[PDB]
């Protein structure tokens, strides 16, 4: 059934991208959050340089 209508199966031209980010509700846990954010930011940059926007949940 997938081919006829992918809900989400097929690839397509990237122009925007979304990110569900999982941070913690509480601090005092080292760089658990910072290292995540720092990775996300760095990867978002490679996207924005290609002229694509990034939405965040």
């Amino acid at each position: 059934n997938l081919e006829y209508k992918h809900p989400y199966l097929e690839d397509r031209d990237v122009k925007r991208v979304g990110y569900l980010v999982v941070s913690t509700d509480r601090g005092l846990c080292g760089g658990l959050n910072i290292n995540l954010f720092k990775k996300l930011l760095a990867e978002m940059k490679t996207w924005t340089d290609k002229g694509v926007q990034c939405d965040l949940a």
Binding site: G27, L28, G30, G31, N33, I34
Partner: protein, 229 residues
């Protein structure tokens, strides 16, 4: 002075003078003051210190190396000597232990003429701006040591980073100091000193690493050093 107008007076260790008066005070047969000093410390200092001044007939510019015993700025010699100075720059061992070798503590060091009406507003605001963020950093220093950097707000994070740039842009190699250190000397314009610090504080030169600022002349040297590393 009482003839020609402009003279320079350099004195090594006014302390050595007071200290001499202490080795004697016992034999001169007077009771000991606080910490074993002479009871006449107040005057022995003042007499000599009051002599150096700008007369109507001629002025005297004078720098002098006032020693502080056992690092105690509360020790009487330094404590009383303070009042007799127009500008009072103080060198701390903590700042030397780092590598900053104009080892001036920019916080405990001040002048009576860091006045806006005197040194212009740009110099003043820059001076007190640099003073503030450097002090705000001293406060954060505690929580950092116990709970690490990752606990600061993204704003305070930037405060320490910008401060640590200032903290080592204060440094610069002295010509006279070339002898025992490879680093060739440099001389910075009072004009550039303002341009750089004002600059770093605005957030212009952030991208550069810290070492870019350590031991250099004008800001344009910090830039070029950042290239090499």
């Amino acid at each position: 002075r009482d003839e020609g107008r402009d003279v320079l007076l350099f004195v090594d260790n006014i302390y050595r003078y007071t200290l001499a008066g202490t080795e004697v005070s016992a034999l001169l047969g007077r009771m000991p003051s606080a910490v074993g000093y002479q009871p006449t410390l107040a005057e022995e200092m003042g007499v000599l210190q009051e002599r150096i001044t700008s007369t109507k007939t001629g002025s005297i510019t004078s720098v002098q190396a006032v020693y502080v015993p056992a690092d105690d700025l509360t020790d009487p010699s330094p404590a009383t000597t303070f009042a007799h100075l127009d500008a009072t720059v103080v060198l701390s061992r903590q700042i030397a232990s780092l590598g900053i070798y104009p080892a001036v503590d920019p916080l405990d060091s001040t002048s009576r003429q860091l006045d806006p009406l005197v040194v212009g507003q740009e110099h003043y605001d820059t001076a007190r701006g640099v003073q503030s963020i450097l002090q705000r950093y001293q406060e954060l220093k505690d929580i950092i040591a116990i709970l690490g950097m990752d606990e600061l707000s993204e704003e305070d994070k930037l405060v320490v980073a910008r401060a640590r740039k200032i903290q080592r842009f204060l440094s610069q190699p002295f010509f006279v100091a070339e002898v025992f250190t490879g680093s060739p000397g440099k001389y910075v314009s009072l004009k550039d000193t303002i341009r750089g610090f004002k600059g770093i504080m605005e957030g212009e030169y952030d991208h550069l690493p810290e070492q870019a600022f350590y031991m250099v002349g004008s800001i344009e040297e910090a830039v070029e050093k950042a290239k090499k590393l």
